[PDB]
Design a protein around this ligand. Structure first.
Ligand SMILES: *[C@@H]1O[C@H](CO)[C@@H](O[C@@H]2O[C@H](CO)[C@@H](O)[C@H](O)[C@H]2NC(C)=O)[C@H](O)[C@H]1NC(C)=O
Ligand SMILES: NS(=O)(=O)c1ccc(NC(=S)Nc2ccc(F)cc2)cc1
Ligand SMILES: *[C@@H]1O[C@H](CO)[C@@H](O)[C@H](O)[C@H]1NC(C)=O
Ligand SMILES: [Zn+2]
Length: 277
């Protein structure tokens, strides 16, 4: 078992409890350094798109470590090449946040932490026929990281919670693990339009929870979407699972890893994208 807040099973111990692959040298998250990174003009605008034929329901679960939206199969997709041919299929979205407004994200941008980081998880359908085939195999996954920032003055309609449909009001103190509820579908395309989908960091890394598999193509958008203090506080109402020391869910982020730990056998590079200027 693992946790974020119990020192016996917490992030500092993952490298020993889950050597495959939390002891690896292509771990995530990392500090996304604007100065150090390599601008690669070939990396294209990200597109998220829906299959309009899909009618299946979306659900959300308190899994004890995060709030996790589970999307139905064959519904939401990512394109990184401008073609809408289902190369990447979205599986779930979950969130990492802080006890306080000045931390919570897993990635940092030039050392800066955001209050909330969302992770849209997809599998390389182009190669693998199902999520469960992809999740443990090389090159199986692509995750999008969406930073959120708190503003004081904003209409609900322009916040990320409009795309999320407030998660159908499920984020509250009675949403205890491992409860799951049906929720309204999440408009992921609207969510993406709240930021610049051409402006992002790109690197090869890992899942950020055990077993930290090193099979994730990461894309982290630089511009945040916007939320309110009221909205962040809804997440903080969720209870942690019983293996955590802290009662309410918060600080559910993994500490920063190095792009290239000293023991690396082949260095990786951090890339950056921007719009055809
Ligand atoms: C999601 O939550 C909001 C806020 O509770 C809902 O309704 C209103 O929208 C304004 C716009 O800025 C909010 O600030 C207000 O709190 C609400 N005002 C009133 C009097 O309705 C919104 O409808 C919810 N969305 C759904 C579809 O559940
Ligand atoms: N925090 S993260 O790095 O974004 C991250 C992303 C994804 C996961 N695990 C998943 S999707 N597991 C799973 C996938 C398919 C299945 F059939 C069963 C389980 C963990 C962390
Ligand atoms: C879209 O949804 C329909 C109906 O659920 C499904 O049969 C079809 O295969 C889906 N298309 C994909 C996954 O590209
Ligand atoms: Zn995550």
């Amino acid at each position: 078992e693992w946790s974020y807040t119990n020192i016996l099973t917490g992030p500092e111990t993952w490298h020993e409890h889950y050597k495959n692959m939390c002891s690896g040298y292509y771990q995530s998250p990392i500090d996304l350094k604007t100065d150090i990174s390599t601008l690669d003009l070939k990396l294209k605008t990200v597109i998220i798109y829906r299959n309009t034929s899909s009618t299946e329901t979306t659900t959300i679960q308190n899994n004890g470590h995060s709030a996790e939206v589970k999307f139905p199969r064959n519904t939401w997709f990512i394109s990184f090449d401008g073609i809408l041919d289902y190369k990447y299929e979205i599986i779930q979205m979950h969130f990492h946040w802080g006890n306080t407004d000045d931390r919570g994200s897993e990635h940092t941008i030039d050392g800066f932490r955001f209050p909330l980081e969302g992770h849209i998880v997809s599998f390389r359908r182009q190669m693998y026929s199902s999520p469960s085939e992809a999740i443990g195999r090389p090159g199986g996954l692509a995750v999008l990281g969406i930073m959120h920032q708190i503003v004081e003055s904003i209409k609900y309609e322009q916040t990320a919670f409009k795309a999320y449909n407030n998660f159908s009001g499920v984020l509250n103190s009675q949403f205890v693990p491992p409860n799951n509820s049906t929720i309204d579908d999440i408009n992921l395309a609207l969510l993406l339009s709240l930021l610049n989908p051409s402006r992002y960091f790109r690197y090869l890394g890992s899942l950020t929870t055990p077993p930290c598999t090193e099979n994730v193509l990461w894309t982290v958008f630089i511009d945040p979407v916007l939320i309110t203090r009221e909205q962040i506080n809804l997440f903080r109402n969720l209870p942690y699972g019983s293996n955590e020391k802290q009662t309410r869910m918060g600080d559910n982020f993994r500490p920063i890893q190095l792009l290239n730990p000293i023991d690396t056998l082949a260095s990786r590079t951090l890339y950056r994208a921007t719009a055809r200027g």
